């Protein structure tokens, strides 16, 4: 019956499709571009001199 509701209401069905796309297009823009996730161990370097 769920699909029926939308089959009656193509404007509603497409408006949900549109907002999803539009929110996801804004999101695509504001995502960071790495090359890999942060999957190398962080590394601290301590240095003394005698």
């Amino acid at each position: 019956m769920f699909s029926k509701f939308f089959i009656e209401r193509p404007v509603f069905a497409s408006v949900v499709a549109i907002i999803i796309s539009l929110a996801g297009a804004i999101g695509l823009t504001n995502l960071p571009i790495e090359q890999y996730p942060s999957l190398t161990p962080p590394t601290v370097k301590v240095s003394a001199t005698y």
Binding site: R9, V11, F12, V15, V16, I18, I19, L22
Partner: peptide
């Protein structure tokens, strides 16, 4: 304005 438009068009099933 874009989101007022779409949200209304859905609620009233007319563009």
């Amino acid at each position: 304005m874009i989101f007022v438009f779409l949200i209304l068009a859905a609620q009233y099933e007319r563009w």
